Amino acid sequence: LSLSNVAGVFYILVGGLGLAMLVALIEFCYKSR
Amino acid sequence: LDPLAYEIWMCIVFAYIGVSVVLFLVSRFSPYEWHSEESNEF
Amino acid sequence: VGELVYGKADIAIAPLTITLVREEVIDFSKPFMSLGISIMIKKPQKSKPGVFSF
Amino acid sequence: EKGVQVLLTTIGAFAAFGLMTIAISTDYWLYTRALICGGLTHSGLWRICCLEGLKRGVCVKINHFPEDTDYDHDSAEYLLRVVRASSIFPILSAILLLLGGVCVAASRVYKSKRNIILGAGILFVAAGLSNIIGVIVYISANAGEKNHYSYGWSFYFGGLSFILAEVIGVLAVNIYIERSREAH
Amino acid sequence: PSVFVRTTAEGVARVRKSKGKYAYLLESTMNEYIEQRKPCDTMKVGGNLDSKGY
Numbered sequence: 001l002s003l004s005n006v007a008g009v010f011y012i013l014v015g016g017l018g019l020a021m022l023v024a025l026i027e028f029c030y031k032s033r
Numbered sequence: 034l035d036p037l038a039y040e041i042w043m044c045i046v047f048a049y050i051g052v053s054v055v056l057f058l059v060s061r062f063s064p065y066e067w068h069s070e071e072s073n074e075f
Numbered sequence: 076v077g078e079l080v081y082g083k084a085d086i087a088i089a090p091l092t093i094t095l096v097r098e099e100v101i102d103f104s105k106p107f108m109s110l111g112i113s114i115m116i117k118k119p120q121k122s123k124p125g126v127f128s129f
Numbered sequence: 130e131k132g133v134q135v136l137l138t139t140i141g142a143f144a145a146f147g148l149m150t151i152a153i154s155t156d157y158w159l160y161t162r163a164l165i166c167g168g169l170t171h172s173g174l175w176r177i178c179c180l181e182g183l184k185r186g187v188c189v190k191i192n193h194f195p196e197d198t199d200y201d202h203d204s205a206e207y208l209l210r211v212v213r214a215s216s217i218f219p220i221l222s223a224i225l226l227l228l229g230g231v232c233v234a235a236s237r238v239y240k241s242k243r244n245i246i247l248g249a250g251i252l253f254v255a256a257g258l259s260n261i262i263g264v265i266v267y268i269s270a271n272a273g274e275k276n277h278y279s280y281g282w283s284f285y286f287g288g289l290s291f292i293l294a295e296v297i298g299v300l301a302v303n304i305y306i307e308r309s310r311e312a313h
Numbered sequence: 314p315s316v317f318v319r320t321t322a323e324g325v326a327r328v329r330k331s332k333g334k335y336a337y338l339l340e341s342t343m344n345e346y347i348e349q350r351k352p353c354d355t356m357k358v359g360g361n362l363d364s365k366g367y
């Protein structure tokens with residue numbers, strides 16, 4: 001398997017990590033108030 | 034290791050490290066949640 | 076067709092297609108091949124299985 | 130612990146920023162064979178420069194957009210080619226790394242505000258992710274474009290940059306945790 | 314310009330030198346023969362629009 005064939009799941013993983021950090025920051029600011 | 038090309042193993046290592054770091058951060062940067070009973074094992 | 080009609084030719088053996096108008100001027104034989112008008116293009120490149128192929 | 134981790138944090142920040150910039154610019158990523166020389170080459174990120182043939186040590190820039198019989202019409206392939214050409218994800222990783230180092234340096238100034246260091250850690254982690262993405266798009270583009278090929282020292286410098294960035298994120302978060310712990 | 318062509322090989326070259334912007338309508342026999350011959354940079358799409366026989 002080349003990396004071209006299985007790149008989509010890497011993109012999805014990175015999107016998920018970004019989303020998790022965004023969500024945690026949102027929760028942090030929310031519980032700050 | 035032939036079934037997966039070298040590049041995939043490298044990026045697997047990179048993503049394992051990224052995920053572990055992100056999980057550590059997310060679980061244990063918000064003082065509000067773990068302030069009491071200082072609270073998470075991550 | 077001009078060669079046969081205008082006497083310049085006696086017979087003809089070739090990938091020549093039948094049709095009414097062409098048949099109204101010269102006798103013909105029976106088909107010795109089957110065919111049909113068909114399209115022709117350049118092979119588009121093999122599209123790799125895109126993202127979300129799993 | 131031991132309160133000196135800011136030093137390792139900023140040293141890692143500057144080192145990883147230097148490694149990333151050096152990798153983006155030196156044009157030593159891919160040792161392979163190209164028909165342009167065909168012959169050997171040491172292609173990089175922006176420009177190709179052969180080392181064999183009639184013209185040695187000759188550097189020319191690469192198009193990223195060859196005539197592919199409307200293959201560039203494909204939305205996915207066009208998007209990938211655009212991202213590879215602009216190479217904005219490694220650039221973004223370097224930018225975030227630099228901003229994180231700046232925030233860490235400022236922490237020595239505005240010691241009252243902790244959120245500076247948390248921002249620094251998040252920036253470093255995001256830089257690591259962006260470096261991953263840049264590597265992935267680079268490799269996928271090269272593959273899309275059965276010979277022998279190999280990766281130059283600059284690519285391993287990029288990998289080192291990623292590792293350093295993630296380590297720095299860990300250290301910054303630990304710093305923030307300790308500071309909050311001792312600050313009630 | 315006029316899509317027409319003087320000879321078959323001219324159409325072959327045109328489709329093979331058009332970045333897939335040209336489609337040529339020829340028979341089903343020559344088409345297959347070309348498909349089998351290197352570099353095999355062409356293909357046949359669809360089915361015969363009408364059968365005629367030689």
Ligand SMILES: NS(=O)(=O)c1cc2c(cc1Cl)N[C@H]([C@H]1C[C@H]3C=C[C@@H]1C3)NS2(=O)=O
Pocket residue numbers: 105106107108109366
């Ligand atoms: N090679 S082929 O299958 O295309 C093919 C097609 C045909 C052949 C012979 C061959 Cl080999 N001969 C027939 C003719 C023979 C006799 C029977 C019909 C006609 C008269 N016509 S055809 O049906 O057009």
